[PDB]
Amino acid sequence: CQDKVILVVEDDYDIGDIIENYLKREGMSVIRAMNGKQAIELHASQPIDLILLDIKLPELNGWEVLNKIRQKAQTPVIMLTALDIDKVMALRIGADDFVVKPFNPNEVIARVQAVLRRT
Ligand SMILES: [Mg+2]
């Protein structure tokens, strides 16, 4: 997973910092987006290998962010979710995955590495 680049889309700075240092200490590179517009910009400009996408974004919603990215590229996604809209959550499998909030940060590492290996 070394050098793999993870786009972390999360508006809570502390939660995003926790995810970031857990991923970096495993040897991955991290790019932070604080909202959906930034996620779309950074996905376009950076060589992203996987997107970790919180459904709870300030203006747009995780699902329509994902739809906008999808019609462009098939980049793997792991959605961070509290579990309504459970239908398209289960649909993520799929080749994608999800992490339920609150999570143990080690689960994020494990699912990122697994999805990357799979894809
Ligand atoms: Mg968020």
Collapse the DSSP code of 29 into the 3-class scheme (helix H, G, I; strand E, B; otherwise coil) and give the result: strand
Provide the domain count of the chain.
1
What letter represents residue 37's amino acid? K
Ligand 1 centroid distance, CA of 92 (Å): 19
Going by C-alpha positions, the residue among 47, 58, 45, 68 that lies closest to residue 9 is 58
Collapse the DSSP code of 30 into the 3-class scheme (helix H, G, I; strand E, B; otherwise coil) and give the result: strand
Compute the distance between CA of residue 22 and CA of residue 18 in angstroms, rounded to an integer: 6
Ligand 1 centroid distance, CA of 57 (Å): 5
Number of Cβ atoms within 10 Å of the Cβ of 7: 23
Going by C-alpha positions, the residue among 41, 33, 38 that lies closest to residue 7 is 33
DSSP string, 77-104: EEEEE----HHHHHHTTTT-EEEESS--
CATH of the domain at 33: 3.40.50.2300
Q: Residue 22 is part of which domain span?
A: 1-119
Would you say 79 and 36 are in contact if contact means Cβ atoms under 8 Å apart? Answer: no
Compute the distance between CA of residue 103 and CA of residue 43 in angstroms, rounded to an integer: 24
Going by C-alpha positions, the residue among 54, 60, 53 that lies closest to residue 36 is 60
Method used experimentally: X-ray
Collapse the DSSP code of 37 into the 3-class scheme (helix H, G, I; strand E, B; otherwise coil) and give the result: helix
Compute the distance between CA of residue 105 and CA of residue 119 in angstroms, rounded to an integer: 22
Chain-centroid distance of CA 98 in Å reads: 9
Collapse the DSSP code of 33 into the 3-class scheme (helix H, G, I; strand E, B; otherwise coil) and give the result: strand
Would you say 65 and 71 are in contact if contact means Cβ atoms under 8 Å apart? Answer: no
Ligand 1 centroid distance, CA of 58 (Å): 7
Compute the distance between CA of residue 77 and CA of residue 36 in angstroms, rounded to an integer: 14
DSSP string, 63-84: HHHHHHHHTT----EEEEE---
